[PDB]
């Protein structure tokens, strides 16, 4: 069909995360990119979402669906991070099953309401 | 223990790029649930460098102990038993809704 061209939302990234402390992910890893296609293109940093290789563990887990299949796991969505496109290496493989991104965002969502 | 809207002095290092290094203040943004849930707190880092983006948001305090701007892009998820922290200041009531209405301006979709 054609190339991607750009990082946009819900893309799946390979990105080094390192160095990191304590239970901050980390390696290099697939992350699912969440903030919109204006601050990407405006900022060049992406929001992620990092995937692990462990099965659903925590609530907050959410079983990875992808387009082309070539990425599997868990996004923990409690480790929200925003990295440096500029500074880090990265490469685009896969992005999120469109049925899968609204869940994505209103489980952040829930995340930020005053309790 | 820490609270959202909490302005903590924490070491942000190692980071790389445009990335906020160094110990400084940040604002804590998740909810109350979140942070004794999972024990990560969600952070904005905040900078004296002044006002240059779009996206920044000048800091206003309850104690008017800390000042600056506030980095609404740069989010972190941090683990705050692996790393120093200190409280110092909270933000002032009137800001609260407009910084969580602009976070959560970056997740709504631009297609």
Known sequence: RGSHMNIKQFDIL???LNPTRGREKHNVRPCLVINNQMSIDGTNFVWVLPITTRGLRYPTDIQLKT???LVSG???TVQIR????????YNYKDE????????????????????
């Open 14 to 16: 390979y990105i080094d």
């Open 67 to 69: 387009k082309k299949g």
């Open 74 to 76: 868990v996004i923990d």
């Open 82 to 89: 925003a990295l440096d496109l500029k500074a880090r290496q």
């Open 96 to 115: 999120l099953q469109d049925n899968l991104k609204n869940d994505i965002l209103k489980a952040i969502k829930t995340y930020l309401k005053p309790t």
